[model samples]
Target: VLFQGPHMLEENIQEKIAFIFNNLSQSNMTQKVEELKETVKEEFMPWVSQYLVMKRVSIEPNFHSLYSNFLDTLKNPEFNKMVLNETYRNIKVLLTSDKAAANFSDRSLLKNLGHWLGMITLAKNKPILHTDLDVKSLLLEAYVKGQQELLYVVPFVAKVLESSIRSVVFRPPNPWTMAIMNVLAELHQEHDLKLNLKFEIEVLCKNLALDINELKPGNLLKDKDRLKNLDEQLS
Candidate 1:
């Protein structure tokens, strides 16, 4: 009953794939694939595996579109890790297992498993290329670490208000400024803010009194009570 059509059809394929992967250690996957082909009918086997790559098929147009979407989801990076692991494990075990014998070719077995798992195109000669492990080498750890060194940024309005409030003895310079401060306080007091506001904060600090380089986020950390209050209000 393993078939691919629309949403329910796509869901059926995922469930079938999960079953196949879960049982890889207990069975000969190539024989299982032949069983799948027989269940679905011999004529439609190629269409299911090549759904993403195919230009057209004899099936209904709407059904074909749904299958295409399912195939596209299979190729997405979010799910490729699961696809790659199951594919590699299935192929590796099948090729090395005594059950494989002379009945199946490594290429054919891998191709069959990949098709059933919705990853035939991704199963290249270098299986590791499709994995996150390969992505680690593309960027150095220090490069990624340097990107996060100044991760969280304060908001500009908050920076300006903090500077203005610190300089004033009793009240803000104007009624409008006090109103803005009060609005901001009310807004931030309700919920925690994100770190993306750092750019705005950086620009305001540079323009107010401090040089761009001198305005380290650490400066806000120096005032313990103020920092505590700000941390509770912002992040």
Candidate 2:
């Protein structure tokens, strides 16, 4: 069925969303919205979680349209209000979802969602999409949940530490690093949590400093401050 390739997955997502959008009209709007909320949690979330596993260094062309579809849904008069609320709700669920069942496949989903949550403030193109949700708080919560559920033990697993580090270090100056800095602090504060990855974490900070300098010069100051604070704790 070749169901796992990037192109195939994106097409499947488009078909699913298309079916939902096609059925939603002013007459059936309320019912559809209610249905969509549940749809997103069940059918849609699994695809999003799966897509995150496939995304890598750059945003894949196939998935771009699918993501844009979500953005467009927010602009649609019939679906905007309902979908936006559902989007926020789904994001919260994805962020705080149980990690006992999570694996490497879900890593990208968590990381990408973290970036999207943090970047809402910078979404200047959508000025009319009014939102009262505290973007920063959500971003912080997503990061913390990701750390507590995902990264806390993964770094100790062979080969997984490097993979986890790549996801965070490569991103631009966003909540990813800030969230990680907070995690490192929390890990150190707990007296019982033995810091075995101290050296690896030090290397991550050093590499992050270099990357931030060239990639996000404006964030260099604040990121460095946080990174330095963590570094001091490790010292």
Candidate 3:
């Protein structure tokens, strides 16, 4: 299920956003987003789209906080460790002692500065969690590039981690940082490091087989009223 929470407007949001727009303009991002949307509609939308709609029924007012949760999730253990290692290196640069650029007096510069300050402060204030946290943007960028199946877990992770996902949460005493640890802990308990990837593929195949074996015209979800009732009940 989706979660509801609060996050103030992020200062670094604009810089990252600017970077994304700049890249799209260079490589035709509009086409990519459109293609991706179409692919989801054709392949995965049928199963989870309804669930997504229902999940958003109640939401928090902090739009930035919502995005922060996702930003925090990039640090989750479900992603590749190598990628995390590399990204955290750069992220450390951003969160450590006056490492960020300090020239701007405008809103853009202020935003960027805020992100750097928050991250650096978090790193300094919290020490024990330093290892668990991937304090690098490069590592996160790697995850973005390397992972093909990020759509499934990324969204969910981000939603849950939004509150403390900023550069600073790497430090201790940060509740959001604790929450992230909680997520990994639950995942560990449920799958024992195997997580969802191993069995998800098999489960999907099994479901597909059942659908094929059960494919009979009269046996199909031909009971329109019954199908509608079931769907409504799930919500």
Candidate 4:
């Protein structure tokens, strides 16, 4: 509900997410997935990274949603690791790469990373009407793979908030605002997250969360049913 997409790549993403969702409950091939991760790392990351940067220069603010949904399709732990590492490395690489050249894709990568993280957040929080899907754990693995059996937690990936990306980029919601908020929720209230900005986020979280509470509907829905989509309301 919180992350709005421009919907340019929505169909492809929905198809991909649907495929993943369809097989997600009874699937594996993490070994087979090892190659897919490498291929995306080799083929997709550079172009998407560049496209992310180039696409951001347009006056229209978009693409973040597509990036978010696209990444969500890569729900395995390995894909998450690849994305996390590449995003971190590329953010720094593109910044330095720009020093010798005339182009930079760093901000786009940062923005893309944050939204993908946000999408992961929103996906896990949404009402799940399906009984067969463990969307919660699957979505959790989107961040840190399946370490849930051991670590049982996934903190914010990379030092994003204090990074140069956060400092250089700003919007009304702030660069890392949604990312931090959603992840902080995911990480539970027990993490000793080291960000220098948490105090502001704490207040922001409380106030905005309260605002959502204030905006609550007057009537409760069918208590036995969870939301599938808004259109489900009509039927």
Each candidate's lDDT (Cα)?
0.33, 0.38, 0.30, 0.33
Error of 3 at 36 (Å): 9.4
Winning candidate number (lDDT)? 2
Evaluate residue 35 in candidate 3 and report its C-alpha lDDT on the 0 to 100 scale.
44
| Distance from true location, Cα of 188 in model 1, Å | 72
Rank candidates, TM-score, best first.
2, 4, 1, 3
> How many backbone clashes are present in model 1?
2
1-235 per-residue lDDT for model 3 (tens digits): 1122233135332232233222333245445344434443333322222221222211212232322233243332322233223333433332232321242222222223233323323423433244444322221322223232222232223332332333354433355444343333332233322435334323322422322222221321223444333311000
* C-alpha positional error of residue 152 in candidate 3 after TM-score superposition, expressed in Å: 34
Backbone Cα, N, C clashes tallied per candidate: 2, 0, 18, 1
Most TM-score-accurate candidate:
2
Q: Give the alpha carbon lDDT tens digit for every residue of 60-81 in model 1.
A: 2223323333434334343433
Off by over 4 Å in 1: 1-71, 74-76, 99-108, 114-235
The pairs that clash in candidate 1 are 153-198, 156-201
* lDDT per residue as tens, model 4, 152-233: 1122222222222222232114423343345444333324432332333354445444232222122112222322322211
